[PDB]
């Protein structure tokens, strides 16, 4: 049984590696098929213990990754794509 | 710049720590306010590279955690709640 305090600290609002789909990140590029289709990014997650508060980023950075993309029967390509990362989170009002 | 292979292995379907909301887990307990409102659980996530295959669990277990719950105007209660964990994932058809 995980003690209340472990669960409390571990789930509290903080940056956590999150597997994000590339389409949600670059939406004006659905006319391509990415591989991998998703990337591991550091994003604010978890909970604030108050309904009024929400977990949001207070410091960000960019990560560049080699992603493959292919237009329907038109050649395999490999390029760089940048994604926004969260280095620090904070519980604040909505 | 993260190399294509690093990104590919890291994002590929596997059990990863995910911060889940307790209501999502116990939709009947909407009557209570849990603290923490969310818990860290091992769940299948990531991607299968072929949108035909989907990342799903092939081995599970239960985790028990001490969670506090309170009814409006009543006292704080502390108890145990069990959540479903994923020990192994696998890419498969829909």
Report the C-alpha gap between B31 and B29 in whole angstroms: 5
Tokens 């799903």 — which residue? B56
Say what the resolution is, in angstroms.
2.5
Stated as kind and residue range, the H or E segment containing B5 is: helix B4-11
Range of the domain at A10: 1-94
Q: How many domains does chain B have?
A: 1
Stated as kind and residue range, the H or E segment containing B9 is: helix B4-11
Asked if the C-beta of A10 comes within 8 angstroms of chain B's C-beta atoms, the answer is yes
Residue B41: its chain A contacts at CB < 8 A?
none
- SS3 (DSSP) at B27: helix
Report the C-alpha gap between A58 and A44 in whole angstroms: 9
Among chain B residues, CA nearest to A4: B66
Asked if the C-beta of A53 comes within 8 angstroms of chain B's C-beta atoms, the answer is no
Q: What beta strand segments (E) does chain B contain?
A: 14-21, 33-35, 38-45, 53-70, 76-93
Report the C-alpha gap between B8 and A81 in whole angstroms: 14
Task: Decide if B37 and A45 are in contact by the 8 Å CB cutoff.
Answer: no
Contact B93, B56 (CB under 8 A): no
Task: Decide if B35 and A49 are in contact by the 8 Å CB cutoff.
Answer: yes
Q: What is the 3-state secondary structure (H, E, C) of chain A?
A: CECHHHHHHHHECEEEEEEEEHHHHCHHHCCCCEECCEEEEEEEECECCCCCEEEEEEEEEEEEEEEEEECCCCCEEEEEEEEEEEEEEEEEEC
Task: Decide if A36 and B7 are in contact by the 8 Å CB cutoff.
Answer: yes
Asked if the C-beta of A19 comes within 8 angstroms of chain B's C-beta atoms, the answer is yes
Report the C-alpha gap between B38 and B25 in whole angstroms: 9
- The CATH number given to whatever domain includes residue A74 is 2.10.90.10
Tokens 């818990």 — which residue? B39
- Number of Cβ within a 10 Å radius of residue A47: 24
Report the C-alpha gap between A74 and A82 in whole angstroms: 23
Q: What determination technique applies here?
A: X-ray
What does the angle CA A48 – CA B26 – CA A52 come to, to the nearest 5 degrees?
A: 25
Contact B65, B78 (CB under 8 A): no
Asked if the C-beta of B31 comes within 8 angstroms of chain A's C-beta atoms, the answer is no
Closest CA to A83 of B39, B81, B1: B1
Report the C-alpha gap between B36 and B45 in whole angstroms: 23
Q: From the CA of B25, how many Å to the nearest CA of chain A?
A: 15
Task: Decide if B78 and A4 are in contact by the 8 Å CB cutoff.
Answer: yes
């Amino acid at each position: 049984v995980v003690k209340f305090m472990d669960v409390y600290q571990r789930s509290y609002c903080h940056p956590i590696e999150t597997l994000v789909d590339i389409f949600q990140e670059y939406p004006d590029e659905i006319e391509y098929i990415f591989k991998p289709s998703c990337v591991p990014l550091m994003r604010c997650g978890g909970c604030c213990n108050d309904e009024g508060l929400e977990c949001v980023p207070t410091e960000e950075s960019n990560i560049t990754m080699q992603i493959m993309r292919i237009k329907p029967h038109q050649g395999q390509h490999i390029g760089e794509m940048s994604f926004l990362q969260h280095n620090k989170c904070e519980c604040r009002p909505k």
